[PDB]
Amino acid sequence: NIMMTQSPSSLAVSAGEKVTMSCKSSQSVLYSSNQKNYLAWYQQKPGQSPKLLIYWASARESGVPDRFTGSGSGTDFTLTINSVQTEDLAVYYCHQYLSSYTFGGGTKLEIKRADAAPTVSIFPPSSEQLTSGGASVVCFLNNFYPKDINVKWKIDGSERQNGVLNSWTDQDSKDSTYSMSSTLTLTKDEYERHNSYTCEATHKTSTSPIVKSFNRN
Amino acid sequence: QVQLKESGPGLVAPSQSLSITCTVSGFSLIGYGVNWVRQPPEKGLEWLGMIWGDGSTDYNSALKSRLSITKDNSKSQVFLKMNSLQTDDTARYYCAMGVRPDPFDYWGQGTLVTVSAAKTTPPSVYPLAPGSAAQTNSTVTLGCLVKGYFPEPVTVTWNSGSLSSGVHTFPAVLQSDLYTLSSSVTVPSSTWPSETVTCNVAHPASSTKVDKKIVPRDC
Ligand SMILES: [Mg+2]
Ligand SMILES: [Mg+2]
Ligand SMILES: [Mg+2]
Ligand SMILES: [Mg+2]
Missing domain, CATH: 2.60.40.10 (Immunoglobulins)
Structure with missing residues (x-):
């Protein structure tokens, strides 16, 4: 052996x-x-x-x-x-x-590889999930480098840390970048308790944070 | 043209047994040995045992005789049986063979074996559509949320596989014995919602197959 x-x-x-x-x-x-x-x-x-x-x-x-x-x-x-x-x-x-x-x-x-800025996309809860009583807010941060990245969830201006789940992909086999998904999972009632939902991402490629928002309106 | 494919149960409860069938193609089991190797979630490779052409077997001593390998030459099948599985037996189980005496040349895709008493649960699939309008000549990112399933794995495709570039499928995260994952797809705004974009989610353990069309929402 x-x-x-x-x-x-x-x-x-x-x-x-x-x-x-x-x-x-x-x-x-x-x-x-x-x-x-x-x-x-x-x-x-x-x-x-x-x-x-x-x-x-x-x-x-x-x-x-x-x-x-x-x-x-x-x-x-x-x-x-x-x-x-x-x-x-x-x-x-x-x-x-x-x-x-x-x-x-x-x-x-x-x-x-060379630094690459992320593309940030925010998605409100689907009607299908709300009908089930859940409200996941999802933020995609795609094709950035290096891996280090800070995402901040804000609700009506105030930050929320409970219920945030993050997942990174492997390095891409072709361009060698990283992607990350951040999911803020609330209940329907919690979600309908506030209006402004913001995924704010900070990365080395820029001093200005990337802000993506939607209003429950 | 050698091929090996593993078929296993996916989920085994602690203290219960594991049975996997390796169906080989491109050669006769009479003439070649078949080996078994597993890869735990934290990666690495651990050899488990083999069965020679003549039917004799060799096993890893660390398995403490819990492992038994048999085969059916006439059906090109190798049978893996392991008893009293514990959590640290969770791994992807490969069957492999070499056309030389060694090293292993051909590997199956492997089958994921999770050791847990938790229950099998089907996923909930939710569409992720943008909240606002897409700018002209832009690329738009869509997604699907796959929530509350167990055990791994699930497979996600977009438009039955016709949409292959611009896809990110994120690794699943475990919470309270339930997995969640998401998949994103980025396409030109001139193709959606003009053309259909659909995510196809399969959870074999639950025999679940779901299509979720990504439809625009009321801004
Ligand atoms: Mg030894
Ligand atoms: Mg980008
Ligand atoms: Mg190259
Ligand atoms: Mg269009």
């Missing part, structure tokens, strides 16, 4: 740059009766199963771009991407298949 350790746990890089990852095994993965290192590298993109990149430590799987090269031997191995593509966003796992099957903890590859 061989243990596989990878470093760094995560890594950010701009498109077109080179990256190196490290995989170390606690026991040698070199077989004397074959002189082969039973070492493989997998790529797993969000929403997809692992994809074999390399085997025998340095043999590249058919169809894999030549920017992917693996090397090393014994207990020290390396994966290199000569020129990172935006689509290379993924987690990279090393793997040994000499004695049973074990995997490393993975190296998460993230993409650095």
Whole structure:
């Protein structure tokens, strides 16, 4: 039972740059009766199963771009991407298949890119939900970079923090931006207790906050 | 042209058993072994076991004999059975195979297994239409709110999949044993409300399929 350790746990890089990852095994993965290192590298993109990149430590799987090269031997191995593509966003796992099957903890590859301002959209509760007694107010903050972003919910001018639920998407595989959804969930009666609903977003790309509002009117 | 597809129950209560079928295509089970690997919510990969061509099996010792693998060569099916599941058995379960002796070349999509005593609940699907008018030659953002379902997963499409670009589907958030998520779609103002925009939500665990047309609202 061989243990596989990878470093760094995560890594950010701009498109077109080179990256190196490290995989170390606690026991040698070199077989004397074959002189082969039973070492493989997998790529797993969000929403997809692992994809074999390399085997025998340095043999590249058919169809894999030549920017992917693996090397090393014994207990020290390396994966290199000569020129990172935006689509290379993924987690990279090393793997040994000499004695049973074990995997490393993975190296998460993230993409650095130029700042991008968000597009903010606010949506009142649907009539379907109000009929059920609920009133969720939803704010979409789409296609921004970097991930850090502050959203503030204001009702009739006063801020509200209870009932706010936020969710971020993964980095986009093509433009490497982030999107966020912020949902303020009230009851129908609470919602009909006020009139002005505001999603106010603050991001590095501008000192002026982005204000999107609607009136229950 | 090797393919593997897992079919599982989606929801298993604690102390109960898990059964998954891997149906393979493009090769005979007589000649190749099939492996099982799971990925917990926090990611990573953990090998579980395999069944060789000749029917012999190897298992991860950490599973403490809770895991049993069988197969039906004549039906191209591999059968995964695990007993007394606990919360930390929650994961996506993959079946995988390699055409060489190793490493694994072909993976199924995996099937999500949630270990919980909570009840299966269908989602509520609400349209998210803008509150005001769209400016000329603008791009308008619509959405659907998928609220109060359990367990994962749900799938969301727009216009039966014909609307694929400009879509963000946000990861689900868990609260009080109920999931909520949303999906946005951004399209030119010249295409909506001129043309139809509909979100299609499926919750297989609840056998739920819902279409919500996004219609303008009274400003
Ligand atoms: Mg062991
Ligand atoms: Mg590219
Ligand atoms: Mg934007
Ligand atoms: Mg129109």
